Ligand binder design. Structure first.
Ligand code: 972
Ligand code: CA
Ligand code: CL
Length: 223
């Protein structure tokens, strides 16, 4: 997160860190045994870390659970990043409490101007690499489709939306990939791609979760 603030320990209880010996992507807990992340964060050997604040110190509240299976969307296109969503089933269910809790899926898509909370342990520099130890937060609005398509002409599909600041300076970045975009208590987006981080007129692009609720529910119900 570039230009954001320290969230405060466990104030984002649905945030998870995907770990393979280091933090490589974020994710969101949607029920005690399933996490939603981005398809491009897929790899084998994933350990899901819940209740984290400092990812380099065991401070208490952490639950480390291995992923039993990862389900990348069948129509995921790695070249366009269209359908960039993945579901991860945990080997055992997590114990939910106030520090580890799931976030709700939306019943409707959000409108432009909706203010959302983006969080993660991704890079904090737009020019260079500085990864934080604790969770960072950023409040950002969903932009209109016209501004999004004007910034990325020919690259935005109906399963994507832009959120952020066109002046640059505040944005999500590498490492935040896979994590949550929560608006009014509902998970509306997944950190997917963007041109650099916090650059002027190049907002972040997010997977539009409201278009995948039936797919998520049907896939969880059959696995
Ligand atoms: C290990 C695998 C997940 C590699 O993934 C990545 C490697 C390098 C950069 C990114 C990345 N940069 C990103 C920048 C932005 C943004 N400008 N808001 C967003 Cl929304 C997602 C990004 N994802 C990224 O997701
Ligand atoms: Ca920790
Ligand atoms: Cl277009």
């Amino acid at each position: 997160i570039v230009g954001g603030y320290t969230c405060g320990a466990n104030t984002v209880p649905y945030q998870v860190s995907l770990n393979s010996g280091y933090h490589f992507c974020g994710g969101s807990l949607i029920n005690s045994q399933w996490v939603v992340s981005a398809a491009h964060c897929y790899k084998s050997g994933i350990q899901v870390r819940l209740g984290e604040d400092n990812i380099n110190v065991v401070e208490g509240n952490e639950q480390f659970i291995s992923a039993s299976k990862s389900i990348v969307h069948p129509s995921y296109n790695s070249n366009t990043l269209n359908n960039d969503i993945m579901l991860i089933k945990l080997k055992s269910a997590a114990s939910l409490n106030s520090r580890v809790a799931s976030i709700s899926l939306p019943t409707s898509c959000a409108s432009a101007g909706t203010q959302c909370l983006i969080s993660g342990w991704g890079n904090t520099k737009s020019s260079g690499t500085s990864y934080p130890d604790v969770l960072k937060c950023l409040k950002a609005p969903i932009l209109s489709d016209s501004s999004c398509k004007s910034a990325y002409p020919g690259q935005i599909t109906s399963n994507m939306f832009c959120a952020g600041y066109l002046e640059g300076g505040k944005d999500s970045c590498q490492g935040d990939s896979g994590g949550p975009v929560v608006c009014s208590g509902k998970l509306q987006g997944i950190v997917s791609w963007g041109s650099g981080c916090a650059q002027k007129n190049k907002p972040g692009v997010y997977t539009k979760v409201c278009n995948y609720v039936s797919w998520i529910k049907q896939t969880i119900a059959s696995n």
